[PDB]
Structures are given as C-alpha cells and as structure tokens.
Amino acid sequence: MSVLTIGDKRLGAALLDAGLLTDEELQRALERHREVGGSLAEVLVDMGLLSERRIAQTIEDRFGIPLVELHRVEIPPKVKALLPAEKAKELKAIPFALDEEAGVVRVAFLNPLDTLSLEEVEDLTGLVVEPYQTTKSAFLYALAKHYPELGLPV
C-alpha cells in the first residue's frame, strides 16, 4: 500500500469517462498499480488491459496534446547533453530537441497526464518543455540505442 500520482488519478478517471472500462475494473487495477510502482498506465499495458494508444487517444483530444513519429526519429548526441538515458528512463520520458538559444526543450513521454514528471523535467534544467506522446516500442528504442550493453534483458 502506497499513494498514486496526479496523472494516475486523472488517467484512471479518463478510462471510465472514455467508456473503456467500468469503475469497478479501475478499483481492482488501482491496488495492482502500487504492487509494481510504475504509473497506472504502465500496469494497463503490462497486464494487457489497454495499450498506450488507447489511453493516449482520449487524452490527445481531451487536452489537445500532440503526437509524433518518434519511432521514426534518431536521438542526436546534441540533445543527450540535457539528461542521460538513465534519467530519461526513470522519468518515463525521452528528450528529442535541445534549443538553448530560447531555453526550450522537446520531450515525448508515455504518461501525458503525468504533470509531475513534466514539472520535474522543467525545474531540473530551468527551461520550458514541449510535451508530446509516444508508445512502448519507441520508448525502448532510445534506451537500447543509448545502453546496448544490457540489450534490455528478459
């Protein structure tokens, strides 16, 4: 037993609000969320209940958040100067652009409603960040390209 994030509350409500599952279903998953400590959206795909795109699609329109083809992009060593892949991994985010002339950065994360991770990413550099959407396959892509030494073990 532990508490949940701001994004977890909002996304949980969004499932019912979007007609994806019943509140009872959410109630049963809420307990499971703390058993894995990841965001409530991670347990959804990890348990096969719903994949990122299904959670993202309601939020995409409900909040007006953009989506990009990150799985079709390469992370330059230029943006790596912001934060290393290890930090990116715990924040469940991946930066793609570094624009120091304007103090702006572009990031894509798996939890669009997780405002806490946005706040953490902005304050950690003192810059503004443009939050975009992405999927698990694209997420694992950048990680494998920055730390192939472990090659994401099973």
Domain boundaries, the chain: 6-64, 70-146
Q: What are phi and psi of 2, to 5 degrees?
A: -160, 175
Chain CA centroid to CA 55, Å = 11
Task: Indicate the DSSP class of residue 67.
Answer: B
Strands, E assignment, the chain: 93-99, 104-109, 128-133
User: Which position has the token pair 């503004």?
Assistant: 128
The letter for the amino acid at 141 is: Y
The letter for the amino acid at 53 is: R
Dihedral sign, Cα of residue 82, residue 83, residue 89, residue 91: negative
Residues 143, 7: Cα–Cα separation, whole Å: 23
Residues 128, 13: Cα–Cα separation, whole Å: 28
Strands 93-99, 104-109: pairing kind? antiparallel
Listed residue (53, 154, 45, 70) closest to 112, CA to CA: 53
What SS3 state is found at 34?
helix
Range 70-146: architecture per CATH: 2-Layer Sandwich (3.30)
Q: What are phi and psi of 152, to 5 degrees?
A: 50, 80
Q: Do 75 and 107 contact (CB within 8 A), yes or no?
A: no
Listed residue (3, 14, 1, 2) closest to 111, CA to CA: 14
Experimental method: NMR
Residues 121, 100: Cα–Cα separation, whole Å: 15
Q: Which helix (H) or strand (E) holds 8?
A: helix 6-17
Number of other CB atoms surrounding residue 115 within 10 Å:
14
Listed residue (86, 92, 85, 108) closest to 45, CA to CA: 92
Edge-to-edge strand list for the sheet holding 104-109: 93-99, 104-109, 128-133
100 backbone φψ class: left, alpha, beta (φ>0; ψ -120 to 50):
alpha
